[PDB]
Design a protein around this ligand. Sequence first.
Ligand SMILES: [Cl-]
Ligand SMILES: [Cl-]
Ligand SMILES: [Cl-]
Ligand SMILES: [Mn+2]
Ligand SMILES: [Mn+2]
Ligand SMILES: [Zn+2]
Ligand SMILES: [Zn+2]
Length: 170
Amino acid sequence: DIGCGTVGCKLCASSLVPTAPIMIPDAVTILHNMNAMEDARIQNIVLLSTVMSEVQERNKAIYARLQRLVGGERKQCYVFSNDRHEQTHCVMEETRSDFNDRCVRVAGRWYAQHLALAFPAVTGVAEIPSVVLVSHDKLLQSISNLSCLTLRQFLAGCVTAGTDLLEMIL
Ligand SMILES: [Cl-]
Ligand SMILES: [Cl-]
Ligand SMILES: [Cl-]
Ligand SMILES: [Mn+2]
Ligand SMILES: [Mn+2]
Ligand SMILES: [Zn+2]
Ligand SMILES: [Zn+2]
């Protein structure tokens, strides 16, 4: 009963678009960059229920701000119940950090493989959708459409891609 939240997905037939990278931030990213999360320039966010629980656990004020973004219904973000979904549900030798790292990695791997099947590549037109785990940790131990970057790296890559596109038109 748990969908991916992506618009036009026939597998799950929603706020996410497959035409932009699917951002999956960990709790540390939200806690350290809540002002950025709230900014209109940051769109296409997957809020994992485990990540939400971790944000609620660490910061009261940050969680209320995160709930407001969801309750506002004007942002391109989706709450994915990774703890209820059969293919992503993890049960905790693991520390609280290692378990939370595994949760995000498992949900990210599911999203990447799922979106590649739901929106397959159209020859010379478009590639499969891109999934980005937004973390300071090397979640993918330091799937082609799955990556792990910090928010700074992700945003610097956006600037590089935009500059390259502007040079192409000029
Ligand atoms: Cl963005
Ligand atoms: Cl990585
Ligand atoms: Cl990978
Ligand atoms: Mn987390
Ligand atoms: Mn972490
Ligand atoms: Zn789907
Ligand atoms: Zn951070």
